Amino acid sequence: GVSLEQALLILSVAALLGTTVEEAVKRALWLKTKLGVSLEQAAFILSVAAYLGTTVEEAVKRALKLKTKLGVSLEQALLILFAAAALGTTVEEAVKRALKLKTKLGVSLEQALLILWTAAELGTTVEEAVKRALKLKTKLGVSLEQAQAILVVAAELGTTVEEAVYRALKLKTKLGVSLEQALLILEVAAKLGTTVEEAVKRALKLKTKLG
Numbered sequence: 001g002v003s004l005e006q007a008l009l010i011l012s013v014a015a016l017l018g019t020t021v022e023e024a025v026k027r028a029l030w031l032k033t034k035l036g037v038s039l040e041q042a043a044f045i046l047s048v049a050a051y052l053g054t055t056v057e058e059a060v061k062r063a064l065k066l067k068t069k070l071g072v073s074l075e076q077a078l079l080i081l082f083a084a085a086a087l088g089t090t091v092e093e094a095v096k097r098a099l100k101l102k103t104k105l106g107v108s109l110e111q112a113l114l115i116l117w118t119a120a121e122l123g124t125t126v127e128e129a130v131k132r133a134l135k136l137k138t139k140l141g142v143s144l145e146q147a148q149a150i151l152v153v154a155a156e157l158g159t160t161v162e163e164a165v166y167r168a169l170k171l172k173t174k175l176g177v178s179l180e181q182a183l184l185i186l187e188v189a190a191k192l193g194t195t196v197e198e199a200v201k202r203a204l205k206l207k208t209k210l211g
Helices: 004-017 021-035 039-052 056-070 074-087 091-105 109-122 126-141 144-157 161-175 179-192 196-209
Strands: none
Touching: 004 021, 004 039, 004 179, 004 196, 021 039, 021 056, 021 196, 039 056, 039 074, 056 074, 074 091, 074 109, 091 109, 109 126, 109 144, 126 144, 126 161, 144 161, 144 179, 161 179, 161 196, 179 196
């Protein structure tokens, strides 16, 4: 039950790490096996360690200690570490900022941590990122989460958000994928230095390899 999403996430992590898909597969599967987590979560851990600038062992150690410290899930600890690595701050500072933003926007801590990460990814203030994202939310009728993903995809593509949404909706129409999946395909192709068709072709080959 290896999904196209899972294959696309692997391709993305191969690009982030600057290694082959074969190497990223192996590295992700070793870590999934070692920790008994999902493939998606193993890919997320590889991404967090890249962002932290630590080894994977070290990132896992930090995440497990932070789970116990705050009583949160592994996923939440990883998101806190990620938001802190993107901010260049301590986890305590990251969570402090998330809590202030949580109260301001009336969103969850997890949503606030994602916003902080996204603003850092865009090189903008949070206020700017939230303004842009909320414009999209209202204009397109997408979630705040979806709007943030659109901002990030557009940046990877080197285009406006209008361009990114135009392409994503074409992929939805043509291939019957969700907007989320269309955005992921777009992002992966940009990260790999390929066309959308070639990214999807690769993903399918990889999905099968792991069948």
